[PDB]
Amino acid sequence: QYSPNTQQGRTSIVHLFEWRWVDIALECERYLAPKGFGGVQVSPPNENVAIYNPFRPWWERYQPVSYKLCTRSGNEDEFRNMVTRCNNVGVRIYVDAVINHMCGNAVSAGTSSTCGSYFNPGSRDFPAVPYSGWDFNDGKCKTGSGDIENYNDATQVRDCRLTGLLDLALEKDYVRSKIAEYMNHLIDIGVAGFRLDASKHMWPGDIKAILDKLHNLNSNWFPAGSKPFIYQEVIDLGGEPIKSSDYFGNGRVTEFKYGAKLGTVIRKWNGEKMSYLKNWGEGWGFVPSDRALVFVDNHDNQRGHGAGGASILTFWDARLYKMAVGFMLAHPYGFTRVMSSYRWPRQFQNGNDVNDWVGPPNNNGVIKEVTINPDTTCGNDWVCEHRWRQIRNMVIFRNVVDGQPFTNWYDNGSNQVAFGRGNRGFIVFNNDDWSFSLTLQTGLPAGTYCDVISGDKINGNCTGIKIYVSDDGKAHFSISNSAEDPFIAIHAESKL
Numbered sequence: 027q028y029s030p031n032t033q034q035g036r037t038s039i040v041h042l043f044e045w046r047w048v049d050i051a052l053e054c055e056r057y058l059a060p061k062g063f064g065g066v067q068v069s070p071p072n073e074n075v076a077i078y079n080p081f082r083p084w085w086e087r088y089q090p091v092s093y094k095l096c097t098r099s100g101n102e103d104e105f106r107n108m109v110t111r112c113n114n115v116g117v118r119i120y121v122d123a124v125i126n127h128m129c130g131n132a133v134s135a136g137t138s139s140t141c142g143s144y145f146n147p148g149s150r151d152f153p154a155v156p157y158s159g160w161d162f163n164d165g166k167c168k169t170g171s172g173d174i175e176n177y178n179d180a181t182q183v184r185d186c187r188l189t190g191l192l193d194l195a196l197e198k199d200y201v202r203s204k205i206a207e208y209m210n211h212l213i214d215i216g217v218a219g220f221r222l223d224a225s226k227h228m229w230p231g232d233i234k235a236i237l238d239k240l241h242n243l244n245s246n247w248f249p250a251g252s253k254p255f256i257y258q259e260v261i262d263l264g265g266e267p268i269k270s271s272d273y274f275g276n277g278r279v280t281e282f283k284y285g286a287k288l289g290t291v292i293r294k295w296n297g298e299k300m301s302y303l304k305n306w307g308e309g310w311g312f313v314p315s316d317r318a319l320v321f322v323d324n325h326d327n328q329r330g331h332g333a334g335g336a337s338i339l340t341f342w343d344a345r346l347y348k349m350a351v352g353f354m355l356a357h358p359y360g361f362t363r364v365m366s367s368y369r370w371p372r373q374f375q376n377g378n379d380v381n382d383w384v385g386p387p388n389n390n391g392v393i394k395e396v397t398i399n400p401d402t403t404c405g406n407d408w409v410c411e412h413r414w415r416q417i418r419n420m421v422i423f424r425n426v427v428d429g430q431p432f433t434n435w436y437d438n439g440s441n442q443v444a445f446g447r448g449n450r451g452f453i454v455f456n457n458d459d460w461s462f463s464l465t466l467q468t469g470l471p472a473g474t475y476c477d478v479i480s481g482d483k484i485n486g487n488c489t490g491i492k493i494y495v496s497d498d499g500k501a502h503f504s505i506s507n508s509a510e511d512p513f514i515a516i517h518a519e520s521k522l
């Protein structure tokens with residue numbers, strides 16, 4: 027459960043948030059494979075409630091109606107087509123599995139679902155699965171409202187409704203089997219793993235009973251005995267009775283303290299500085315590296331819908347965001363996930379973005395195709411952060427330095443720091459309000475190296491900054507606090 031099952035030498039996955047299957051298939055072939063991305067986290071592929079008020083919000087996909095592979099992203103054939111084409115090019119697919127609940131208890135019965143399946147939340151009837159009143163935790167929850175009212179009670183956090191979402195009785199073998207049937211269908215199609223949505227709201231033991239029913243990965247693409255990669259979404263900042271460590275026996279866990287603290291450090295909130303990142307990782311009270319799935323922002327908290335709240339860096343904060351993602355991709359801790367978003371009309375009223383529910387670019391509800399501009403950026407309001415040179419090049423940087431120790435750390439006691447990864451890579455950052463000009467020990471072999479943040483090594487030459495490393499591994503770096511990207515990264519393969 028702990029290994030991503032990526033191809034040897036590919037170290038990151040991208041969340042192509044709300045993308046259609048056909049666009050992901052194309053992207054696997056035209057960009058992800060050539061650029062060395064290990065895999066893709068896709069949005070929930072099962073049928074969900076179609077919510078028209080507000081108009082098709084992104085969160086309607088977290089309210090299941092059935093396990094039919096029928097959504098705004100595409101149908102079952104298109105889903106299969108995408109998994110096959112991506113796998114055939116070495117890029118894995120990870121499914122967002124929404125298995126803790128069905129839709130809101132207050133949603134109207136009818137056939138307002140993405141595949142036209144009938145459902146009746148009021149009577150707990152989801153015939154397309156099928157599920158009935160017996161498969162929900164209505165009689166097990168002990169709160170007066172039936173919803174989760176207090177997180178200091180670990181029992182109600184698991185048995186009651188997360189803001190009204192009907193809660194599946196996961197201790198029942200029937201329910202566990204319906205979920206396993208769904209996941210095995212996906213494993214046999216070829217997916218490499220799952221993000222278990224809302225894991226904090228499920229008992230570690232019920233999750234394990236479900237995982238025990240899962241198949242090994244498809245032997246047509248994976249070695250025999252391969253187990254699906256499992257990463258559980260557990261928001262564990264401090265102070266709650268539920269700890270992410272309680273889920274280690276099941277697979278990896280999302281480490282939300284990662285992006286939260288990186289954001290405050292990079293924003294320099296409340297006295298924090300980059301020099302403090304010297305012992306970043308377990309030293310900061312994070313989970314062990316081999317159990318961590320890290321990221322700067324995720325689909326929830328990039329729109330204020332989650333852990334970290336205000337300090338979270340997102341594409342809207344482009345200059346600082348690139349620096350944070352760069353630090354994440356160069357640091358040895360955890361398995362990294364890169365975010366890929368869409369633009370929405372933020373609209374802050376009293377500090378709250380009243381448009382945080384806006385769904386993906388669409389024409390009358392039909393999600394728009396990702397179009398590629400001549401300069402490789404995307405059109406139709408897809409931000410495509412994974413295509414930004416500074417990010418794409420750092421994805422490759424991680425691949426190149428995979429396995430190398432963290433060494434040659436330097437910091438000016440403020441916000442100018444640098445470190446290397448063995449003798450395969452080196453990165454320098456200037457987040458101070460003055461310039462950086464110093465000769466540092468890089469641990470790299472003598473030569474001329476292309477800085478992959480400002481440019482690329484394109485046919486024997488660098489299109490941006492060049493660094494010259496002398497025989498003793500020393501090199502001079504100059505970064506003014508006015509640079510569009512206040513950081514420089516060089517590695518074995520950008521060497522001229």
Ligand SMILES: *[C@@H]1O[C@H](CO)[C@@H](O)[C@H](O)[C@H]1NC(C)=O
Pocket residue numbers: 485486487
């Ligand atoms: C690097 O570019 C310069 C021209 O701008 C040229 O003199 C040189 O041939 C180039 N090297 C290669 C390998 O293309």
Ligand SMILES: [Ca+2]
Pocket residue numbers: 126183184185186193194227228
């Ligand atoms: Ca639950």
Ligand SMILES: [Cl-]
Pocket residue numbers: 259280324
């Ligand atoms: Cl997540």
